[PDB]
Ligand binder design. Structure first.
Ligand SMILES: [Zn+2]
Ligand SMILES: [Zn+2]
Length: 72
């Protein structure tokens, strides 16, 4: 299982067990820089439903997990 948006995972990448989407999400979101932001709220839980409610929490969540797009 995805350890970010707590869904069915499709392999670990960037050092942590994540889904198929969290890989692509993070890899564009880091080495591209996307605007989400939930630093002014920081309310919502990110899971299998609430992932589509906020793509800010899931960015901070994955990093909390131990993600790094220069991981080993
Ligand atoms: Zn995910
Ligand atoms: Zn949020």
């Amino acid at each position: 299982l995805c350890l970010v948006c707590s869904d069915e995972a499709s392999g670990c990448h960037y050092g942590v067990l994540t889904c198929g989407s969290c890989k692509v999400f993070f890899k564009r979101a880091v080495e591209g820089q996307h605007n989400y932001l939930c630093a002014g709220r920081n309310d919502c839980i990110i899971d299998k439903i609430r992932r589509k409610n906020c793509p800010a929490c899931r960015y901070r969540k994955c990093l909390q997990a131990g993600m790094n797009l220069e991981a080993r």
